[PDB]
Design a protein around this ligand. Structure first.
Ligand SMILES: Nc1ncnc2c1ncn2[C@@H]1O[C@H](COP(=O)(O)OP(=O)(O)O)[C@@H](O)[C@H]1O
Ligand SMILES: [Mg+2]
Length: 378
């Protein structure tokens, strides 16, 4: 059976396989090429992926996400203490280790973060198997460059309990470089910049490649900046508009808000290709149907400061690595958010017109590289 490459992401995961010299990003049951890192527990079942995300506004306390933020970490971790203040699900301490507590089939159950991630890992695996028409065993799973040994250990473990034989854990920026073939030996040192703007995490990494050997010279970014922050700005904008037209504040109604957010995220995706998108929501609050729309222009100004601030981590990464803009040879876009036109303009302007590597879907780049790496290791 072919070895596969898996991008176990904070908000979205993706799986690819290298066959016949070509890499293939496998679409799921719903036809999507990336699937949410969501797990939901109900009275009758355990939902994973799209099915899980497609019901979060109905089962908030029992729909788990952001497990990547917990994995390989302790409960006493300041990160965890901060993070949990925003999760609708419970996180309990267990001999120092954090566990997520949910209600499955009427009974109260808790899971270790690596158990949650294995659930997502199993979903990717079954997706691969359904496509390949054969059982998948060996795999290469990716992890951020800043993960310590504990976090990598836990990610590896999430793999074993999923029935996956993890051939190797490689960094996400490194996987992105390999996808574009920037790992080939050209008898010279090459500086590559990875700009990763995903769903809830932002990471900039500068890699130096010589004779096939990578070297993460610098890294910067924000663990709490991603495509979700852009959705929120849209939401706040519409919560205000609704109040104008219908003099009703839907803030308190968690369901109205979550349904509006889903419509915003989708409009956002459209905005990367069109200049305007319509928001059509039936019976948002009470029996009022919310029919409206946004323009790319307005979208851009609602997120202006966020988009712009994206350059700060870029400057920092540069000075740490001790390099000038002119010294970086290649720039590769990773993450779903990099499909945004204004982000591409902004970065290009910063690197004074330099060409951006973006022929491979940024949200598939990591999986793609892992799949190639899985291939060589098998
Ligand atoms: N066309 C698009 N325009 C803007 N954002 C997009 C587009 N397609 C996907 N996204 C966003 O990408 C994010 C997911 O990014 P991804 O890199 O897949 O996640 P992760 O950070 O989990 O690795 C979401 O915020 C989603 O809205
Ligand atoms: Mg990612």
């Amino acid at each position: 059976g072919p070895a596969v490459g898996i991008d176990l992401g904070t908000t979205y995961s993706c799986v690819g396989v290298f066959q016949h010299g070509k890499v293939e990003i496998i679409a799921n049951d719903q036809g999507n090429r990336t699937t949410p890192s969501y797990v939901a527990f109900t009275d009758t079942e355990r939902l994973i992926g799209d099915a899980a995300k497609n019901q979060v506004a109905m089962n908030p306390t029992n729909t788990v996400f952001d497990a990547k933020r917990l994995i390989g970490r302790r409960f006493d971790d300041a990160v965890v203490q901060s993070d949990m203040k925003h999760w609708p699900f419970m996180v309990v301490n267990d001999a120092g280790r954090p566990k997520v507590q949910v209600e499955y089939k009427g009974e109260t159950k808790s899971f270790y973060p690596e158990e949650v991630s294995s659930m997502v890992l199993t979903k990717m695996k079954e997706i691969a198997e359904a496509y390949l028409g054969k059982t998948v065993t060996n795999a290469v799973v990716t992890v951020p460059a800043y993960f310590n040994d504990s976090q990598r250990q836990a990610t590896k473990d999430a793999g074993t309990i999923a029935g996956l034989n993890v051939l190797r854990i490689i960094n996400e920026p490194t996987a992105a470089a390999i996808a574009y073939g920037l790992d080939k030996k050209v008898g010279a040192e090459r500086n590559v910049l990875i700009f990763d703007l995903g769903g809830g995490t932002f990471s900039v990494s500068i890699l130096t490649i010589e004779d096939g050997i990578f070297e993460v010279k610098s890294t910067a970014g924000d663990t709490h900046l991603g495509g979700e922050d852009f959705d929120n700005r849209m939401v706040n904008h519409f919560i205000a508009e609704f109040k104008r037209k219908h003099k009703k504040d839907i803030s308190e109604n968690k369901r109205a808000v979550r349904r509006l957010r889903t419509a915003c995220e989708r409009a956002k995706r459209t905005l990367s290709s069109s200049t305007q998108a319509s928001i059509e929501i039936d019976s948002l609050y009470e029996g009022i149907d919310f029919y409206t729309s946004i323009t790319r222009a307005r979208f851009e100004e609602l997120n202006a400061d966020l988009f712009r601030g994206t350059l700060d981590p870029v400057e920092k990464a540069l000075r740490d690595a001790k390099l000038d803009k002119s010294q970086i040879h290649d720039i590769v876009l990773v993450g779903g958010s990099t499909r945004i036109p204004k982000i591409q303009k902004l970065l290009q302007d910063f690197f004074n017109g330099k060409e951006l590597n973006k022929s491979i879907n940024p949200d598939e780049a990591v999986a793609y590289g892992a799949a190639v790496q899985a291939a060589i290791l098998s």
